[PDB]
User: What shape does this take?
Amino acid sequence: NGNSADAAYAQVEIQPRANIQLDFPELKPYKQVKQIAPAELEGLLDLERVIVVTGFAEVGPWGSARTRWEMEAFGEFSLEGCVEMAWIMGFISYHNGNLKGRPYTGWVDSKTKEPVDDKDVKAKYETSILEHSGIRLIEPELFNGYNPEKKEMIQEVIVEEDLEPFEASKETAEQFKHQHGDKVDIFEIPETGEYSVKLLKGATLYIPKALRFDRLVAGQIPTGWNAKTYGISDDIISQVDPITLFVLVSVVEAFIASGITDPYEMYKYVHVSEVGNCSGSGMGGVSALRGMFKDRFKDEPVQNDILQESFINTMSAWVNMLLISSSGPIKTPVGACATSVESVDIGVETILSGKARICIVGGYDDFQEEGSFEFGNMKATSNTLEEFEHGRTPAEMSRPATTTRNGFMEAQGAGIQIIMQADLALKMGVPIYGIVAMAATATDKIGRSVPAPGKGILTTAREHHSSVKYASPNLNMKYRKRQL
Amino acid sequence: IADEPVKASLLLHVLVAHKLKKSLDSIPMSKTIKDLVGGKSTVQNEILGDLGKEFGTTPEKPEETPLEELAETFQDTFSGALGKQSSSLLSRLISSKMPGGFTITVARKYLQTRWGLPSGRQDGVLLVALSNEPAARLGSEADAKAFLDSMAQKYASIVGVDL
Amino acid sequence: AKGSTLIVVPFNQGSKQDVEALIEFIYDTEKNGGLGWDLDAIIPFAAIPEQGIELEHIDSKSEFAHRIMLTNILRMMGCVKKQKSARGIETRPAQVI
Amino acid sequence: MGEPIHKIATRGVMLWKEFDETIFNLPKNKLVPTLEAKRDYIISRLNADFQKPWFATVNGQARDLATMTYEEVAKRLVELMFIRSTNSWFDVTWRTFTGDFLRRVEERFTKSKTLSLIQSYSLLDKPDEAIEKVFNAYPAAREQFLNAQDIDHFLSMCQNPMQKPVPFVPVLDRRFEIFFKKDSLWQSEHLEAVVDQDVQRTCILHGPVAAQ
Amino acid sequence: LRAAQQQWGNDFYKRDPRIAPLRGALATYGLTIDDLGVASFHGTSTKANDKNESATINEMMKHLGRSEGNPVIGVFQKFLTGHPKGAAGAWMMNGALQILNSGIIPGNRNADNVDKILEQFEYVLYPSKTLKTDGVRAVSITSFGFGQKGGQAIVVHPDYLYGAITEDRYNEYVAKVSAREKSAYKFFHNGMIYNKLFVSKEHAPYTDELEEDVYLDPLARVSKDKKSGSLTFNSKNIQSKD
Amino acid sequence: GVATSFSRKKARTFDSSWNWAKQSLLSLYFEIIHGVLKNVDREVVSEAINIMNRSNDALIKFMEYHISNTDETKGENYQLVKTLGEQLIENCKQVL
Assistant: This one.
């Protein structure tokens, strides 16, 4: 019967392509969303005094908030998550046009340029994605060569016999002479015009040595993450601390979650003085602090403006200088681990005071050698050699509320929210992910240990219970709606 | 091979190229300093400072005027002199990123020996090398020879001589 | 269930050093870093598969497997007996299944 | 290719002449920046006067491919390429184009491997029933704008040399003069397949002197 | 009007020492202390922090008279991410929002064995696997920094806001969001495939001549420039009577 | 093959059944409300056994709150969870 009767039988398979969603909140019909709230609530609240979250984003060890939430909630990537992760990590790139003579529109491997289909991204990359994401052994390529196995130091030694002379420029030799005094002889070479530096007996010298450090693991932004992927230019990357790049991406990606693709659109509804930035850091630009403290001392080439890139308030500056262009409040908090909650509390109060109608809140911090080391000396972080003694893999070293928990796992990244007055969110028709009903900070009490967590925040629940025999009509929304 | 002094058109190019942390050819001469660093006022005044320390006398408001024309403006008073800034930068290149025991003397002697380039040409080859900072102390003597070989090629290419 | 506990320990029944350690660990006091238990039952079901190993093919694997499945089961029972008799435990026998 | 042609001065040809004087004569550097400057005008005048209308037009409202839903794109394809009067696709290769699009819709909105609801493009000879069927199984595609990847695909298919040139302009770009001028001669003989059956849209070749 | 609405709707409990800030923040939307379903804990994985935080939430709940047998469900996101210092609470807030809008509560998959000491805190449950619930009404976010920096934020389900507006105003909002969502998706995919989600602004929305005029007019607003297509400040819409 | 695997430091203890009881109840409660477990599925009975085997006063209060605050009018699945709930509380009280 030939191939004719068996060709009309042959059926066409559809293979799914990743249709990545922004996961805006699902708005219910009015009849249903009027059932949850009391009927008295209508026209009771001043909507300028209600603060809502209209967008959020992050950069952290599991990519964006979308990919992180997949891995948090479901513990495995969907097609959309797996494609997003492959795009973030730079495994796949998009290609439109001529590829090997045929015209091709879709994903290609970023190395080989071979076309990739969305179905094949999980088989081809997911193992590479999971291996180079989340809490894992410290990758030296990500931290300017930093290898905690071989942690560089210098020991001062008084030399016991004269060194061989070495050639140096005149200015360099003069700088040796100044430092060492009589413990060095510098002599011009008439031939070439260069100088011969001889270190004499009793001169101070610094010999490099390596310590084996015990904190080998960290939460690190996925390998191959690159601000150029999101479209940040090289001139910005070359200028700013790495932490700034996590903030710029988190901020644009938070605006996108708010459905605000052009930030200037906010200036159709509010003044340029009504857009705040209350986002902060604990340590700020610690790569720039390393530059000015250590790399300058070693006479390495460090940009002249490295100081400005260190400051905790410079990340918010770059955000305003590159994207927002507001003249609204800027209130950069420093709260160590509680920076981001303090950031929200300031942002809420900034808006409630009337000094802003929109506010970028959040927090950001980098992981670097010197911080890692100092959290070790304070025994705040988990000793990775003890975790390996106990058979723990890197992925099971952060185990809150557990019998055997033995210190925190240091990570890096940034989280941003956009908060607004409800009244303006509704007007602008931006998505509303939640109400910020309360935010508060509290100190503890007299003490002598800075890192001791205390019970100060308990005050958020303070109330008087001496006379509670009959319910107060202030708690009764029907009474409040009558008085309004 | 004939000796020439280093032209201000090369020296100025190399100082700018080095300062912006960019390749020598990614910067076009017919395109001014205020356009190169249009953003950062700090970096502008820092190139202007380097041109001052190098050539001594600077023209009036020269940041808006192209590199190509400013070459000839500086060229008149300039006389194949490496000067404070270029001499410093070349010494840092050698001291910081050469296999060790491989100094100015043995770099210049290797240029004079193999390539036969005299003082004025040597200066040019070291300046194009200052454009192409290897970013890491290169390991062996053979890698340094290979580096100067490759930078002597790009020098011959840019000036228009044959080896 | 309530009262239950589950201790999960890495273990190579093929190692006699592992067998002694495991029973030392179970029987040793919590001060010394053990469980301070006394076994009521032992269920030594560890075993490695052999397929297509007839008489002429009996070699390193089959001899190792025999150590897991007989020799070291006898040594576990031995170790448990020595720990119980050290502590004069004569009225709480361990049921070996 | 810049050769003179004698045509009946219809609205379509007057638009053609105008674009030859103001757009196609410009140098390659100046063509792209000029098109966005005039975009709203061009799109209006294509839709009014020419035989190849602006593709991205929903009930007279001039959209763009990026601001059209998958459904709007599949319906618009039918309204320009399928002839209601003679219940058939003007060209088989246009039916292929529209089936290939609908398969791409199924790919973008299916969650797992499935069988196509379009097993052969013969089923498209009832185009309303095929569209209803696809956009019932994937109703998300009634509400979402085109994915940027699917816009890039669609314009890739518009440039397929093994099919009849698409009877519309889908984008203003360097390629605009070819989308405007390619395949101009058939319409005059097939007014059933022109937008409003309007002769005034079409290029008719004729002599000034023979016309007497 | 607003001042009245604020006094009775938003700020009723500010002068009132019988209402805790935590209770008043919920009571605003008609929620009770029993509606605070989830507590995203700082949960650093340190001996001292995880016990203190559990003790501190447990005491809040006990004082405010949360119903026996209604513990808050603890979320310990740091099991997955690790602790990124300043960024810590922002991640928790992102996850608190993602909980509210999905009803899914994630599980501490590294909670191999919950610490016996933490059993005394009856108002805290420590799940090890994800719970698809029928809805979360409110989440509590608590951080504890070095240097006595304690923080707490409450985030309420956004559907409690829309009960405060008319159906006409709700339906107008839903139309704008739908439109804005579509345009966002358009922008997102374009920017992703073409690596241009981030686009640095070249210029402020005003020229250097209008800069001090815009700053000084509180009603100045951008509009679409016809030429560029970009949002700018026009001289016409600065100190205009309209 | 005779390489040592055993180390005391590697011994993982699991004893926190007080916590898992509540998680197991609350997992069941939502599985019944989302129609994942029906009234014919045996996994309902198995899970009820594993909850009775972890009964204590804290778990009974956890049940009484979660069940007695189930609005049975919201759907048939809510009536099913409230009926089974009430029964499992009675069971858990007896086998306390």
Remarks:
- Residues 55-171 of chain D form a domain with the Transcription Elongation Factor S-II; Chain A fold (CATH 1.20.930.70).
- The helical segments of chain D are 11-22, 28-49, 70-81, 92-109, 127-137, 148-157, 176-181.
- Chains D and F do not touch (no CB pair under 8 Å).
